Design a protein around this ligand. Structure first.
Ligand SMILES: CC1(C)C(=O)N(Cc2c(F)cccc2Cl)c2cc(C(=O)NCc3c(F)cc(F)cc3F)ccc21
Ligand SMILES: CC1(C)C(=O)N(Cc2c(F)cccc2Cl)c2cc(C(=O)NCc3c(F)cc(F)cc3F)ccc21
Ligand SMILES: O=C(Nc1cc(F)c(F)cc1C(=O)O)c1ccc(-n2ccnc2)nn1
Ligand SMILES: O=C(Nc1cc(F)c(F)cc1C(=O)O)c1ccc(-n2ccnc2)nn1
Ligand SMILES: O=C(Nc1cc(F)c(F)cc1C(=O)O)c1ccc(-n2ccnc2)nn1
Ligand SMILES: O=C(Nc1cc(F)c(F)cc1C(=O)O)c1ccc(-n2ccnc2)nn1
Lengths: 314, 319, 319, 314
């Protein structure tokens, strides 16, 4: 519910489609009025072909990966073989079953050579690639996303370091001094726009003062200084509200990555990873122990006044 | 060059192995003496069956990608179909070839076209439902490396852009000002890259031979909506047998500490093996960036090390 | 959307036409009713012959690319072979398939393997020597657009990086300083893009209704080894029936003037048709850059026009 | 002679290889001792098939380009057809000749349909692409290079306006002021690494003075000013030469383009276009009327002191 454009996690629509396809194929096989022992024989033979093709692809991948045995696989052949062929025991059982089914069910070495040729063509010309939807699904399942690491690092390195101390500093500033809200408002620009000043993003927002700076050592730096800025959110020139505004710096860096050529990062990838960053940041703040209603994410996309949105969240 | 354990980028060993396999298969087909027409016919029929299976798998995936059309594909069906089934025109041409060459060509090993379609749909549905069509870790790693689908890629580019790209231009001026106003501190930034991702908050606890000495002048600058953000780096000293061997500006790579924390947290879905791989990828990507970046022109150095030891000796060796 | 005559980027009409042609050819092959095995056999034989012709052409090209190995290919033969013949592994696999599927398969229309190779080498040599295997200007334009092999692409990116990326950040401050200390000058730099590339040195001669009014404060900055390079922009006023209708920071795009000069010079190898194509492409590329660039945010406006007229009326209309 | 790594223009090595291949093919046809009427028939049929395939490819390209008729082809169908099919008259003559030879020489519509299918596959899957060497040769022949336009624009827009009066400015400065050279030394770093100051590139080069600025209108800007800088060249810490040093700004922008992701410009392309820029700029200055031994290009590659190179060129 952060923003309507944020993608929801993938469910089981592909599984439902596969179930429907399985049902339809069973219905049409029954309706063909043709003996089912041949059906089972063909199905077993086809799965055997798929298993042997996977074996050959994994053997080629193993030939590639045996150079990285000391680097990625800590100098062990077993981990390399597991990486390139899945579980060795189950894969071996399936390959022996497939070999037996070919050598038993009614040539074989000719089919084996031709299947090896097909697998070689698949590897060399890239026939069996990966569609963008498949890559996205695999990355989201295995958390192989730039945004996942970026948002978890934003939470661990910054947010959990300040949030309770930030509430304490807000209380101290209020009692010393138009009270400021006791929460850090972090803006998430989905599409674009991450100026170094809130005034540049919107002149209606004006820097008011600075919170009592927090100085604590963090990752090899003695007395690291945190300086959070209070902003007045005005409305027709009057102080409608005031609170601690901030921008999610990993979003700025996602934009910068999309700018650089060496990053291998595209505008579509930039927007997608910004959406995932916001999604997983909200997801981990929901279950965070530090987040105790002392942090508010304001996700927005420019089609617009930021100050009105911040007041709406206030 | 940072560390021997950091893996080199993937080469073309798989393609060379595939070429050798193709040559062996061609030699075997020539030796067996089977008619070449049958060999070509069955090869084309196999490729057609694979293409039709890809069609069915793409349709099944489109069944679940169609409800993310507004959120992920800007509400356009063409982008969804392109993401699921690939390029619509090339995929359509390939499926037209597959249909024509299976409906027409004879097939002794394989059922007629309607029976083939039923059986291939059955097998593809089984593969999708049971998860039989899966990717081994090596293929997933290769795809992620080619497509930059790593947490380490983003983390290293973020360490560059968000932190290094800000202090590196002014670090030389700050060190010169410190030297003039007040041994001599080195002019290079020494980023420590522990491959074990053990990053103490206080660097003194890492090794007693490094003790905090002083602080560089604070660099005040606006950044991402924080007015007057303060960068207060630190100047440390290195002790050899208790004597002041050298001084430097030492710190750790914060993304490595966040990687370790992710490996600690359960919700992160991050494992120790994944932690080590992404630490090495972060180090490699940062090294490549600094090699290509114009800001780091003899201005920053990276200390990559693995605990099997004293950090002070390694830093002095790099001095 | 600058001008109607500026061409849109090339779409996929060729691929759609190819798909329609493929469908028609498949329908025709079904209609005649020749054995499908013969169809597949002859298609594979034709593709094999094409691949072997590509091999021969690549070898002939490698004969001339081998003497630029040190200058162009850093002295390594692998880059030369990759440039000439493509990817060595994929090309080798395709060549092995072609050789096997021609020497093995029967062929009623076509010679035996050695006779085919001799005749195909003869034909490829004839194509290379007589220049028969040439590219029509449409394919050359498509390849140049896809690969950014245009003078206009580099010229537009150079106008952005070398000039606009330097004055646009401080243009607002300069105009504000001028306004405070002195009608009111507009806050946007108006870059005129004449598609005829007629760029007068003195903009007054283009149309008398535009007249120079004053000069913005000089921007002094280092750039490309020129110490204290001075950008002295000028402001113009726009007249309507002799009255001061408006005032703005108006200037021309110098790369268009250089394009016109290239069309004038004989050694440039630049024609009037090429001049017009590259002018329109420069306008399109600059528009795309300014749309994507962060420097241009309500700071610069492009006035693209073609003489069939008064420039002042167009600039006022855009005002 | 500007730099050893500068590529020389492509010669006729491909033509010589084609001639050798033609000779070897003639020898082997004579060697097989097999009748030449069948040889001529096969050759004519092969060229006819190639011509028909080119016709089909051009028809597909015409279907693509017919929507750019008003933009690129001035709203005339004849220009679009010429662009997509070459010369209409010669192409038509060749197609009628090929059709007649294909039909007359001992099916036809079946072969035509199969050739159309092959051409459709070539277009859709991109079998008949363009190798990097072929693209480079075509671009060099047709001057479709970024560097060509960049260097011609550098000559016309900058050098053509300062070179005539640079000698007068230098003479005036020398009279008012230990003699500075009467040539503009332009540095051409093949790595496109240009600092904004010569001191940053090499601290042994120090800024000496400023030439009397040249003020003249240029391309819609009244009284555009040029401020050339005289630098100091030092050897062993003492003055050894004084000259007007400058960097080729198109090389700066080539580097910047290689940096930006939107440019579609790579590092290999950056180096190649830097080399072509230097080559064609040296070619332009060889016949430029303005260049009267009042301009010297300096090309170098960092494996080295720039000041020593400038002294060597002095
Ligand atoms: C390369 C070679 C000789 C080969 O090794 N196989 C594996 C294989 C089978 F797939 C099927 C039976 C035996 C073998 Cl032994 C193959 C298959 C075809 C073919 O027509 N497959 C259609 C097809 C099916 F037959 C069953 C099915 F469930 C789905 C399906 F889509 C053509 C050439 C080959
Ligand atoms: C698609 C289809 C049916 C077709 O339309 N042609 C055109 C054509 C010729 F190219 C050659 C002769 C007749 C026809 Cl009619 C074709 C050719 C082959 C083939 O085997 N070409 C080898 C080959 C040669 F025969 C002569 C040569 F100088 C070089 C060469 F490389 C296979 C299938 C076809
Ligand atoms: O790593 C840092 N920052 C970031 C890293 C990211 F990966 C990112 F995506 C965003 C940032 C960011 O903060 O902008 C960082 C490190 C040290 C200090 N520092 C040194 C002295 N005092 C403070 N400040 N920042
Ligand atoms: O994003 C930040 N940090 C990091 C983000 C990462 F993704 C990471 F991997 C490491 C860090 C890190 O520096 O520890 C960050 C943001 C704002 C401020 N801040 C606001 C006012 N004063 C200081 N400080 N740090
Ligand atoms: O177009 C310009 N420059 C360039 C264009 C390129 F395509 C390139 F490759 C490099 C340059 C460059 O000079 O750096 C340009 C235009 C106007 C003024 N100017 C405005 C007021 N006074 C002077 N100055 N420069
Ligand atoms: O490169 C320059 N100009 C251009 C280059 C182009 F490629 C182009 F298409 C247009 C121009 C142009 O501005 O006319 C240039 C370089 C140095 C100085 N300069 C040196 C001292 N003071 C001023 N002025 N101009």
């Amino acid at each position: 519910s952060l923003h309507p454009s944020i993608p929801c996690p993938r469910g089981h629509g592909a599984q439902k489609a596969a179930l429907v396809l399985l049902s339809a194929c069973l219905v049409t096989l029954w309706g063909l009025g043709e003996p089912p022992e041949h059906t089972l024989r063909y199905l077993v033979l086809h799965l055997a072909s798929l298993q042997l093709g996977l074996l050959l692809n994994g053997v080629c991948s193993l030939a590639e990966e045996l150079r990285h045995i000391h680097s990625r696989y800590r100098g062990s052949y077993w981990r390399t073989v597991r990486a390139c062929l899945g579980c060795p025991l189950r894969r071996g059982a399936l390959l022996l079953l497939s070999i037996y089914f070919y050598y038993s069910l009614p040539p074989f070495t000719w089919m084996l050579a031709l299947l090896g040729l097909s697998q070689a063509l698949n590897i060399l010309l890239g026939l069996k690639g990966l569609a963008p939807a498949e890559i996205s699904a695999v990355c989201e399942k295995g958390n192989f996303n730039v945004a996942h690491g970026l948002a978890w690092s934003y939470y661990i390195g910054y947010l959990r370091l300040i949030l309770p101390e930030l509430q304490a500093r807000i209380r101290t500033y209020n009692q010393h001094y138009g009270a400021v809200s006791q929460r850090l408002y972090i803006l998430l620009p989905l599409d674009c726009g991450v100026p170094d000043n809130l005034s540049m993003a919107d002149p209606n927002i004006r820097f008011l003062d600075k919170l009592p700076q927090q100085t604590g050592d963090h990752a090899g730096i003695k007395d690291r200084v945190y300086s959070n800025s209070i902003y007045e959110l005005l409305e027709n020139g009057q102080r409608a509200g005031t609170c601690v505004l901030e921008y999610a710096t990993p979003l700025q860096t996602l934009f910068a990555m999309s700018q650089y050529s060496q990053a291998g990062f595209s505008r579509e990838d930039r927007l997608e990873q910004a959406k995932l960053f916001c999604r997983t940041l909200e997801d981990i703040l929901a279950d965070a122990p530090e987040s105790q209603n002392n942090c508010r994410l304001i996700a927005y996309q420019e089609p617009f006044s930021l100050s009105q949105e911040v007041l709406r969240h206030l």
